[PDB]
Amino acid sequence: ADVPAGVQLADKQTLVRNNGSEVQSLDPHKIEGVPESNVSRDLFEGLLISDVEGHPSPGVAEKWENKDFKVWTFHLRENAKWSDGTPVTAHDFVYSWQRLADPNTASPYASYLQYGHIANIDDIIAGKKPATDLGVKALDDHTFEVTLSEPVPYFYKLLVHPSVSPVPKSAVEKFGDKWTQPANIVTNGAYKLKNWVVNERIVLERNPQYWDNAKTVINQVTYLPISSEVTDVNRYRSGEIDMTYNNMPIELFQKLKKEIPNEVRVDPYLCTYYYEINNQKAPFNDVRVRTALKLALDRDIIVNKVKNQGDLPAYSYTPPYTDGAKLVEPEWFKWSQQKRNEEAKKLLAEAGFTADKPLTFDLLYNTSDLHKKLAIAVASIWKKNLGVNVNLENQEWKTFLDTRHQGTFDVARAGWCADYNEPTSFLNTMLSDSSNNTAHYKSPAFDKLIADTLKVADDTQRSELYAKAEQQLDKDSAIVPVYYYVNARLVKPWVGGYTGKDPLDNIYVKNLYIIKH
């Protein structure tokens, strides 16, 4: 942390953060969510990290170069160490990205190496080539070189993501899936794992071996797994919680706005809230059905009347304020709701849905006040605007992700947040073979538009193809865009260092500090 001149610090430097839910795991190769990444950033540090405002900055790599945006050489700082005191080296990285590529890891983020276009990743995911063939090599203990199959100018921006964080081979190999237990884990970020009580708390303690330890100020941070936004606000206002999770409850937000204005942080956020449709299951494999639901959902009601927390009605997957996005707002978004509603009902009648045999299906969401309340209004809206019947189902975060990967669903509440600030961070997740593709959407035309983005060396060219890829996605009604999020959470007046300027919300506890109160 960079403490401002003259701020007086508290004696006690401890932080309690709500984290939305029980993390799927602490293994960087086994995770895919915001809660998983919150804790990962404090424990495992990659090549680059986001600074306090989100800019890609030095992590384990102190400086790097590229040759034609295809061969990237990372110079690793020499004092980078793990919590057992042993050096962090380029060999750590080679082993880790290899472990991520390997199909026997079954990482949900295995496709991240495709997104970066590391050489040979497609045959490695496919089983055609062993993982040791990945285009990565340690030139020496402090020099890691990456070779891509094509120029990727924004490549280094991908490197702040948890999936490309180093994992310590000797803990993984001797303890298997128990490597992340506190007695077995070894970490290289600012913190170390002190305690892990499933559905109770995760307690991190400062890691003295961390290379930038001298600037770390919080000595201990606890991550809570509270999925009730009401309860998180409640324990924040009671004094137990210092920073809530950034999901706000409908029951209390307006009141909070009026009661504690200074503590309500409302900032730009590159996430999109959508109802993810299972594109390979009947009757959702019929574009008419999918378009009816997209059009009959009333964004003005959901976003401005029922949520009203500063979100913006959405008409696409990629957020339009993403760096490099110049999106075409479709015609249906400008229509009246009644015109959307008529159109939606017409397509369903063409799909053969009658009043005697209505369209009835499930709507899966992750346990949450916010999502339950939005789910009930959507159900109602869809019921009165289109005549469809919806059955609401909640699941704990972990089970919920796993249901969506399984394809054991109809429609599911979803949210995708950028991993790096560029449109492919969203668009790559819809590629036919993406490991992130829980929509189970396969469009050859969609795939080709995105494959062409790196065959041109023009920004305008590349934004126009992103724009066309969003239109293809909208043409197929792959999803139901609801709103672009804002980052809204409560932060105690004494928490210094949360600027609200990173649009990915990549917060590190090593950059925070408690002001004396």
Curated annotation (Swiss-Prot):
Report the subcellular localization.
Periplasm
Q: What induces it?
A: Part of the opp operon, which is constitutively expressed.
S-S pairs: C271-C417
How does gene deletion manifest? Mutant cannot take up cell wall peptides.
Swiss-Prot/TrEMBL keywords:
Disulfide bond, Peptide transport, Periplasm, Protein transport, Signal, Transport
What are the GO BP annotations of this UniProt entry? peptide transport; protein transport
Q: Name one GO molecular function term.
A: peptide transmembrane transporter activity
Annotated Gene Ontology cellular component terms: ATP-binding cassette (ABC) transporter complex; outer membrane-bounded periplasmic space
- Pfam families (UniProt xref): SBP_bac_5 (PF00496)
Q: Does the keyword Electron transport apply?
A: no
Q: Which PANTHER family match?
A: PERIPLASMIC BINDING COMPONENT OF ABC TRANSPORTER (PTHR30290), PERIPLASMIC OLIGOPEPTIDE-BINDING PROTEIN-RELATED (PTHR30290:SF10)
Further details from the record? Isothermal titration calorimetric measurements of the binding of lysine-containing peptides of different lengths to OppA show that the dipeptide Lys-Lys is bound with 60-fold lower affinity than related tri- and tetrapeptides (Lys-Lys-Lys and Lys-Lys-Lys-Ala, respectively).
| UniProt remark on domains | Accommodates the ligand side chains in large hydrated pockets which impose little specificity on binding. Tight binding is achieved by utilising the hydrogen-bonding potential of the main chain of the ligand.
Q: Which family does the record assign?
A: Belongs to the bacterial solute-binding protein 5 family.
Free-text function comment from the UniProt entry: Part of the ABC transporter complex OppABCDF involved in the uptake of oligopeptides, including the cell wall murein tripeptide L-alanyl-gamma-D-glutamyl-meso-diaminopimelate. Plays an important nutritional role and is involved in the recycling of cell wall peptides. Binds peptides containing from two to five amino acid residues regardless of their sequence. Also binds cell wall peptides, such as L-alanyl-gamma-D-glutamyl-meso-diaminopimelate.
Q: How does it assemble?
A: The complex is composed of two ATP-binding proteins (OppD and OppF), two transmembrane proteins (OppB and OppC) and a solute-binding protein (OppA).
User: What is the protein name given in its UniProt record?
Assistant: Periplasmic oligopeptide-binding protein OppA
Q: Which organism is it from?
A: Salmonella typhimurium (strain LT2 / SGSC1412 / ATCC 700720)
